[PDB]
Every structure is written in C-alpha cells, then in structure tokens.
Amino acid sequence: GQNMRVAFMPWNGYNFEDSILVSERVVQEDRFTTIHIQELACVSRDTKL
C-alpha cells in the first residue's frame, strides 16, 4: 500500500462508525490509482455454408 498521514478524530460525523475520511489532495496526487487491463476476444467460428 502507501503511507498516509492520519488523525484519530470525529469530523462532522463523516467518520461516524468505520468510514475513512479522505482529503481531496489524495485524488489530486494520483495516489491509490490502479490500472485494470481487462481483455475480451471474438472468435471466427467458420460455418459449413
């Protein structure tokens, strides 16, 4: 994973029970960005006609 600066404190009930509040500076800094190389494929299935 990655190192992140944390602070155990309630914040307007956004971390109410087990939700993790995340600053906008984490999306801006391209942190926790993952790539996903999915790949489909089409066959030929030659018929008799």
Partner: protein, 403 residues
C-alpha cells in the same frame, strides 16, 4: 450376389447419421443384440420489438388489431411478404377499405428501424429521405430519381440517365451518393444469428507434412452381443425358444462382423484418394489435378463400386479444411504441360483473376483465355465463359461503373 449380404455391403454407402438411425431401427428386433440449466434467456428482434412499439402508441382496438396483421407479415430478412390488398381481405370486413388500413400501415413506417415493413423497395428508400433534414443539398434531386428513372440507375449506364432527366454530371452524381448512403433492407438492422453446422469423420494425423488413415473417434455403433440373454440358449425350454435364440444369435454375429468390416474398409480407405491429390491441399485450391473413381480403384487395392460406396457421404476433416469425399470428383481438361487440369481449378482462377484486375476496365473471356495460355494451361474460351456464368459472376462489361 447375396441377400443377407447384398445390403450388408450397401449399408455403409450412407451417412453415419442414418447408419445410427437404422442400427437403432434393428437394435430392438434382436434381444440379444445390444449397444440444472433451464435459464434459456429470451430476446426481441423486429417481431417482438416491432410489437413492443405498437402498444406504446395510441392505436384503437380496430387499429391495434390491424397493426398486428401487418406487423406479423414482416419477413425478418427485410420487408413484408404479402401485398397490401391481402391484408384487407384477411381482416374479414367490407366496410373497411384500403384507406383505413393505409394509415395503420403508414404509421408503422416510422418506428425503430426507419424503413421497416416497406414493401416493393422504392417506398422504403423514399420514406427514409423523408425524415432527413430538408436543408440537404441533394434533397430534391434524389427524390426525383427515386419516384422514377430507377431502372436506368440500376443499369451499368448513367450518361443516358442524366441527359434525359435534366441532370448534370457533377451535382447529380453526388445525389447518387446520398441515395447510395441510404441502406436498403433496414429490416435486418435489428437482426443477428448464432449457428454452427459441422460434421466429423476421418481427421488428420499431421505427421511430417502428412495426414492419413488416423483413427476413428465416435462412429462405431457399440455392437456387443448380450451375455445375460445368451446364457439361456443352450438351456432352452422348447424347440421354439432354442430356434429363436440361435437365429437371432447368428444374425447378430452377422451384423457385428458386417459392422466391423465396414469400419476397416473406410478406415484405411482415407489415404489414397487424398494422396493421389497432394496439390489441392498443400499448394492450394488453385493447383488441382483431375481425379476419377475409375482411376482411384486402379491405384488402390480394390473394386470401383467398393470404393465409390465408402467414399460417398463421408465428410473428411483436416486442419486445412473439411470437404466431402464425393466432392473431390472432377472431370478432365487438356493442358499439355505434364498433367491435365479440372474445371473447378478454371473457376477458382477466373475468380482470383477477376479479384486482381483493374476495377474500371474489366477483365474478359478472350483475355482470360490468353492469360491462361501464358501460365501454360491452353483451355477453351467456352469453359471459362461457363465457369464464369456458373458462379453467378455478373458480366464484367456490365460490372463497370463510375470510377
């Protein structure tokens, strides 16, 4: 020259489908002879989809009823089948005229696939131009050549068309493009397939550039004499019983043996016709010698009929393609170049040469005959003409258009 054998050797000249079927046919007669996922997802496609739209729109009972009649006569390929008047007669009315049905049949002309259920080409295309923006440069031109003067357009000629219909060579040609970029047969827009069609038989061995007598996968009809019923033969009660059991046993043994005999014959029989022909595969579809059954029985160790019967209805299969054994039969064609040729090879060459030509200036018969003579084939001009017109290849002088 035998009954109990005359067929026992004509019972293989058919496909394995029927063989299995007749083998079952006679598998009941002889007691002693023997051998979730219900989630089928449904779909639509311009029948249900067409009907789907019908409900949404505001059509009255008499109109809705009529709608289905015409929406159900819409052939999947493209347009409707029967004529319009047909439809009036299949309502079963006298007060209802064509006008009443016209609307209902006119309203549908503008549904999912614009042009669906058109009938007689012209109406389809014409409608498609209606929903187009009227601020289109070639709007009036296209429409003018859509209502009339279509025959000429259909022909290879176009100069006579423009001179009569008050059209120029520059602008009018571009109007053509708007009629050309208009997709007739809109009914197949929401159409699709999902088929298969494939049969196995003798496969390939693939050994150092050679495929052969290989093996038999699943074509042997499990014919093992029953042993629980056979134990009662010798210890039969009456004469009736004993006779019965012995007759059925002898015939079973006969059939066992005839089935085994038929297997082997065709088993190693798939290696001499195909070898006598090692040019159509390796070299390609062009490069083909003439072969005859009479000549095949001469090469192999057997009679002509014997081999003709085995080869019939026996689809072969190599990683190079699957063709029926009987289809390999070809006539003759003098060449004078160390071996004769076939008309299928004429046809394939005509076709590969019409493919690689100038599109504007078409290739021809005497030209094709000359090209052939250049490569060293020496054929008639007729054979070429015939092989060209057999493949539904249009005339090349009529295949010309505006480059």
């Amino acid at each position: 020259m035998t009954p109990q054998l005359q067929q026992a050797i004509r019972l293989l000249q058919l496909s394995t489908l029927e063989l299995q079927q007749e083998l079952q046919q006679a598998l009941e007669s002889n007691p002693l002879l023997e051998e979730p996922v219900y989630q089928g997802e449904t779909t639509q496609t311009l029948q249900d989809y067409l009907m789907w739209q019908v409900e949404l729109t505001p059509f009255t009972d008499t109109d809705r009823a009529i709608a289905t009649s015409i929406v159900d006569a819409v052939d999947d390929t493209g347009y409707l089948t029967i004529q319009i008047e047909d439809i009036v007669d299949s309502i079963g009315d006298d007060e209802i005229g064509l006008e009443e049905v016209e609307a209902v049949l006119k309203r549908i002309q503008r549904f999912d696939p614009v042009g669906v259920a058109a009938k007689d080409l012209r109406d389809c295309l014409l409608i498609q131009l209606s929903q187009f923006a009227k601020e289109t440069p070639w709007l009036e031109e296209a429409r003018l050549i859509i209502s009339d003067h279509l025959d000429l357009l259909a022909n290879h000629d176009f100069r006579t068309l423009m001179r009569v219909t008050r059209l120029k060579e520059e602008v009018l040609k571009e109007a053509v493009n708007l009629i050309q970029s208009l997709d007739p047969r809109p009914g197949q827009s929401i159409q699709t397939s999902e088929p298969e069609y494939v049969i196995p038989d003798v496969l390939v061995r693939k050994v150092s550039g050679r495929w052969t007598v290989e093996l038999n996968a699943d074509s042997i009809p499990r014919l093992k004499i029953n042993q629980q019923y056979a134990a009662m033969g010798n210890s039969a009660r009456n004469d009736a019983d004993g006779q019965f059991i012995r007759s059925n046993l002898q015939e079973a043994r006969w059939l066992i043996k005839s089935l085994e005999s038929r297997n082997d014959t065709l088993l190693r029989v798939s290696r001499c016709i195909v070898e006598q022909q090692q040019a159509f595969f390796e070299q390609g579809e062009e490069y083909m010698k003439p072969m005859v059954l009479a000549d095949i029985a001469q090469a192999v160790e057997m009679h002509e009929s014997t081999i003709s019967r085995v080869t019939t209805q026996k689809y072969l299969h190599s990683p190079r393609g699957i063709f029926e054994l009987k289809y390999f039969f070809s006539s003759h064609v003098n060449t004078e170049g160390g071996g004769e040729a076939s008309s299928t090879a004429i046809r394939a060459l005509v076709k590969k040469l019409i493919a690689a030509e100038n599109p504007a200036k078409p290739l021809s018969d005497s030209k094709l005959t000359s090209m052939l003579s250049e490569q060293g084939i020496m054929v008639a001009r007729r054979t070429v003409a015939k092989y060209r017109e057999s493949l539904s290849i249009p005339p090349s002088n009529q295949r010309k258009q505006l480059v």
